[PDB]
Amino acid sequence: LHVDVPKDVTRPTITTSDEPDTLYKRLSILVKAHDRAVLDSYEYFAVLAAKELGISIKVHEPPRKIERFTLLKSVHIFKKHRVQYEMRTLYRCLELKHLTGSTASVYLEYIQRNLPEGVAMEVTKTQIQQLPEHIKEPMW
């Protein structure tokens, strides 16, 4: 729009609670896909988004898995003649660090909503909390 622009765009309401926030020491995001190029683009989108929100991120490529199975090519007899099929799974792991619970929800929502088709995520949150009040003091 050249001349017609919103004036005061309405923004969602974010209210700070009185409950303490979760503290994630680590947050591993393992995305899976049949296509490496999609993982490269999603890795670029996710790493850029993390750096723009202040999150610390590292990326590595877990070894790929290929599952192969054999089938009978003909409809009837001709046993020795087979056809083989495979499914290739590729992995990209986004290891985030030192995240509060508010930062991990907004980031995960943003990147999960933009997860391309054919891509599956496996978030592995690692929360850190104090010791139970009972355990703190030995009681007989």
Binding site: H34, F69, L71, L72, V83, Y85, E86, M87, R88, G118
Partner: protein, 101 residues
């Protein structure tokens, strides 16, 4: 309409095994142990026998959902080798390709 009469009989076997699962579980537990009197175990062996034969879960056969083929089926997709090959060879299965190596 299901594919054939063989698929219809199997469908009924699958719905009657679901109905009698709790019953056959509770009764069969009384037999798979050595802690209860053998008189009770011999009697529970007859209560399970009296249940209808289609409740028995070993009479279910995995058939192709689209052609009702009894053998040659792949359990992850529930399709026969012939039907699976038609969808796979046309690019219609997500991520399935031919294996060249």
């Amino acid at each position: 309409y299901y594919v054939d009469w063989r698929m219809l009989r199997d469908l009924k076997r699958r719905k009657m095994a679901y109905e009698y699962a709790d019953e056959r579980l509770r009764i069969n537990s009384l037999r798979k142990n050595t802690i209860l009197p053998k008189d009770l175990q011999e009697m529970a062996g007859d209560e399970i026998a009296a249940l209808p034969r289609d409740s028995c879960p070993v009479r279910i056969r995995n058939r192709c959902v689209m052609t009702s083929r009894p053998r040659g089926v792949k359990r992850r997709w529930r399709l026969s080798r012939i039907v699976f090959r038609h969808l796979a060879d046309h690019g219609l299965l997500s991520g399935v390709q031919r294996a060249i190596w």
